[PDB]
Every structure is written in C-alpha cells, then in structure tokens.
Design an enzyme around this catalytic site. Structure first.
Site, mmCIF file in Angstrom:
data_model
loop_
_atom_site.group_PDB
_atom_site.id
_atom_site.type_symbol
_atom_site.label_atom_id
_atom_site.label_comp_id
_atom_site.label_asym_id
_atom_site.label_seq_id
_atom_site.Cartn_x
_atom_site.Cartn_y
_atom_site.Cartn_z
ATOM 1 N N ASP A 27 0.826 -1.202 0.000
ATOM 2 C CA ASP A 27 0.000 0.000 0.000
ATOM 3 C C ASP A 27 0.864 1.256 0.000
ATOM 4 O O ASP A 27 0.667 2.156 0.794
ATOM 5 C CB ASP A 27 -0.925 0.007 1.220
ATOM 6 C CG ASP A 27 -1.971 1.101 1.150
ATOM 7 O OD1 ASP A 27 -2.622 1.235 0.092
ATOM 8 O OD2 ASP A 27 -2.145 1.825 2.153
ATOM 9 N N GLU A 53 1.641 -3.054 -5.204
ATOM 10 C CA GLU A 53 1.240 -1.667 -4.912
ATOM 11 C C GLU A 53 2.344 -0.788 -4.356
ATOM 12 O O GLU A 53 2.270 -0.224 -3.261
ATOM 13 C CB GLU A 53 0.085 -1.586 -3.894
ATOM 14 C CG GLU A 53 -1.164 -1.524 -4.792
ATOM 15 C CD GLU A 53 -2.313 -1.235 -3.798
ATOM 16 O OE1 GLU A 53 -2.017 -0.216 -3.145
ATOM 17 O OE2 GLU A 53 -3.252 -2.053 -3.716
ATOM 18 N N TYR A 112 -0.165 -8.081 -9.345
ATOM 19 C CA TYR A 112 -1.172 -7.268 -8.642
ATOM 20 C C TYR A 112 -2.361 -7.238 -9.598
ATOM 21 O O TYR A 112 -2.306 -6.560 -10.636
ATOM 22 C CB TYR A 112 -0.581 -5.906 -8.316
ATOM 23 C CG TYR A 112 -1.585 -4.933 -7.710
ATOM 24 C CD1 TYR A 112 -2.474 -5.348 -6.751
ATOM 25 C CD2 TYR A 112 -1.626 -3.604 -8.156
ATOM 26 C CE1 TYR A 112 -3.379 -4.481 -6.172
ATOM 27 C CE2 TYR A 112 -2.588 -2.749 -7.648
ATOM 28 C CZ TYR A 112 -3.431 -3.171 -6.645
ATOM 29 O OH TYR A 112 -4.378 -2.338 -6.118
ATOM 30 N N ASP A 151 -1.304 -10.334 -4.811
ATOM 31 C CA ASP A 151 -2.661 -9.923 -4.418
ATOM 32 C C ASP A 151 -3.528 -10.207 -5.631
ATOM 33 O O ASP A 151 -3.442 -9.510 -6.654
ATOM 34 C CB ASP A 151 -2.568 -8.405 -4.140
ATOM 35 C CG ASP A 151 -3.972 -7.815 -3.843
ATOM 36 O OD1 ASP A 151 -5.017 -8.503 -3.999
ATOM 37 O OD2 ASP A 151 -3.934 -6.634 -3.473
ATOM 38 N N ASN A 153 -6.805 -10.208 -5.671
ATOM 39 C CA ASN A 153 -8.015 -9.418 -5.598
ATOM 40 C C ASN A 153 -9.302 -10.234 -5.679
ATOM 41 O O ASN A 153 -10.209 -9.879 -6.440
ATOM 42 C CB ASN A 153 -8.031 -8.320 -6.716
ATOM 43 C CG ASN A 153 -7.673 -6.971 -6.066
ATOM 44 O OD1 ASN A 153 -8.114 -6.703 -4.947
ATOM 45 N ND2 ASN A 153 -6.803 -6.215 -6.717
ATOM 46 N N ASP A 224 -4.471 -12.556 -0.828
ATOM 47 C CA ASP A 224 -3.100 -12.745 -1.255
ATOM 48 C C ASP A 224 -2.821 -14.300 -1.166
ATOM 49 O O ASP A 224 -3.160 -14.916 -0.176
ATOM 50 C CB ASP A 224 -2.076 -12.083 -0.266
ATOM 51 C CG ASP A 224 -2.392 -10.579 -0.325
ATOM 52 O OD1 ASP A 224 -3.290 -10.064 0.361
ATOM 53 O OD2 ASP A 224 -1.884 -9.821 -1.169
ATOM 54 N N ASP A 249 -2.490 -2.190 4.725
ATOM 55 C CA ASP A 249 -3.800 -2.813 5.027
ATOM 56 C C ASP A 249 -3.777 -4.323 4.702
ATOM 57 O O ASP A 249 -4.744 -5.028 4.982
ATOM 58 C CB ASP A 249 -4.973 -2.128 4.322
ATOM 59 C CG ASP A 249 -4.709 -1.766 2.904
ATOM 60 O OD1 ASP A 249 -3.595 -1.979 2.332
ATOM 61 O OD2 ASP A 249 -5.625 -1.244 2.222
ATOM 62 N N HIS A 250 -2.692 -4.795 4.112
ATOM 63 C CA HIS A 250 -2.478 -6.220 3.849
ATOM 64 C C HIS A 250 -1.337 -6.714 4.721
ATOM 65 O O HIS A 250 -0.433 -5.962 5.150
ATOM 66 C CB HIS A 250 -2.086 -6.489 2.404
ATOM 67 C CG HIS A 250 -3.110 -6.317 1.308
ATOM 68 N ND1 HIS A 250 -3.606 -7.388 0.525
ATOM 69 C CD2 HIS A 250 -3.709 -5.198 0.886
ATOM 70 C CE1 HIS A 250 -4.454 -6.854 -0.360
ATOM 71 N NE2 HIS A 250 -4.559 -5.517 -0.153
HETATM 72 PB PB PB Z 1 -3.880 0.022 -1.411
#
Ligand code: PB
EC number: 3.1.11.2
Length: 259
Positions: A27, A53, A112, A151, A153, A224, A249-250
C-alpha cells in the site's frame, strides 16, 4: 480469531526448506518503509520478496521493478535466469502489474490483479484480464513448474472472507471473480498452497479495510495467495499468513519450498 500455526520447515518427505518467498501488498512503498516494513522483512529474511502496490517505481540485492498507482517489485538473493515484465498482451501491460522471474527449477510470477472497482465499474475489464492472465500462465506452466504470488483481488470461497453474505455484489467476492479464480486453478492447473495445507481453517485473512476498525475485529478477506503447479506440491513445506506484521492494510504471506 486466528493464530497462524508454527512454521513447518520440512517437506512431506523430510527435505528441509531451501527457499523462502515473501509476498506483501505494501500500500505505497514509501509509506510502508516509514511504518517500519523493511525492518520486518530484514527479520523475516526471505530469499525472494515480491511487493505489490509500490506506487513508485522509476541478502536481497537483485531487484526488479515495474510501474505504470499500482506498481510491483521483485527482490531476490540469487539472480534469476531471466526477468520479464507483463503478460504478453498490450491492453493488460500498461499498469505495472506483473513480473516474471525464471529460476533453474521453476518460474515465479508476482502479480497485482486489477480490482473490479467501486460500483463494479471495472468488472467487465477484470474478466478480460482474468482470461488473458490464465492463458499466459498456462503457457508458462506448460514449460516449467510455476509459482504465482501476489494480491489476486478475490476471496475464493466463503471461508476466505469474514462477511460473504454482505459482499456478494462487492469487488473481490462477485460470482464472476470467484468463477475466474476457480478457472485459473483448474486450467493451468494450480493449487492454493495455504488452502491445500489448511482446508477447513476459518478466519485466516490477509487484508482488512483501514476503515471501521476491521483488522482489530478480524473482518478481513484473503486476497493474497501462493499458487503452485501440482508438481511442486511434494516440495511444499508451508504457506504462512503473517497476521501480526503491520505496515499496510495487507499482511505479508510466506512460502517455504524444499527444492
Ligand atoms: Pb492500497
């Protein structure tokens, strides 16, 4: 409530792990570095660190970056045989999303995956990404054993997220994204390392919205993954979720392989 089990560092045959891969949607690289993200990595001491990211671009001395927002990075103790960028399709190769690093006994792909967006504005494009991505990976895997991390998603099944009923129309848990993931696993074929090892383990997540105090409540999603060719299942020692690593946040995920 979830406490990741202890690190299994030997394969089913008793061979000691020789390769530790860490993957982490940070992030923002600069922000993550200010929140002591690099410190945690130094203690984890992976052989290979994949980052998603990074939003930046331009024992882990070989470092490879791809940027368009977004951005991924791949930092390796040893040198790959070959490093390449994207998935061979103009449309899907403009947002700094995929690095392909080839080693002696396997190919590593860090990705990603494009989010489907608020309102599902980008869900049609997501499906087109998913189809091209699965075709590219099937290509790679027809030649060498594949490891895919990053990630992706999507929370595959209801056990992969804390609130499946409230998210069946939100990005990350639509029937289309879920079907897309089940199709990548079938078609390349790939197995989900963590779920292979811990098939019934609830509440194991790798992402929690910054809002609403979700990490403290464990209201998370598993987005992830480490996905592996079936021939690499004999080398699988463990696939970890580092729930307690802060910085984004991950949370990171860590794979141990005995190759
Ligand atoms: Pb982010």
């Amino acid at each position: 409530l979830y406490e990741d089990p202890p690190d299994q560092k030997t394969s089913p045959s008793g061979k000691p792990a020789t390769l530790k891969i860490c993957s982490w949607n940070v992030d923002g690289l600069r922000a993550w570095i200010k929140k002591k993200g690099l410190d945690w990595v130094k203690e984890e001491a992976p052989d290979i660190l994949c980052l998603q990211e990074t939003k930046c671009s331009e024992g882990l001395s070989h470092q490879y970056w791809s940027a368009p927002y977004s951005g991924v990075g791949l930092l390796s103790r040893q040198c790959p045989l070959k490093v390449s960028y994207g998935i061979g399709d103009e449309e899907h190769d403009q947002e700094g999303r995929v690095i392909v690093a080839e080693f002696d006994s396997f190919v590593l792909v860090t990705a990603y995956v494009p989010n489907a967006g608020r309102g599902l504005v980008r869900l049609e494009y997501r499906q087109r990404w998913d189809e091209a991505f699965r075709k590219f990976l099937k290509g790679l895997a027809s030649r060498k054993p594949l490891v895919l991390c990053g990630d992706l998603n999507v929370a595959h099944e209801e056990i992969d997220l804390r609130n499946p009923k409230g998210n069946k129309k939100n990005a990350g848990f639509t029937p289309q994204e879920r079907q897309g993931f089940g199709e990548l696993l079938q078609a390349v074929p790939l197995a989900d390392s963590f779920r292979h090892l811990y098939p019934n383990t609830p509440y194991a997540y790798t992402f929690w919205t910054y809002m609403m105090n979700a990490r403290s409540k464990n209201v998370g999603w598993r987005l992830d993954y480490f996905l592996l060719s079936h021939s690499l299942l004999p080398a699988l020692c463990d696939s970890k979720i580092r729930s307690k690593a802060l910085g984004s946040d991950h949370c990171p995920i860590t794979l141990y392989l005995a190759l």
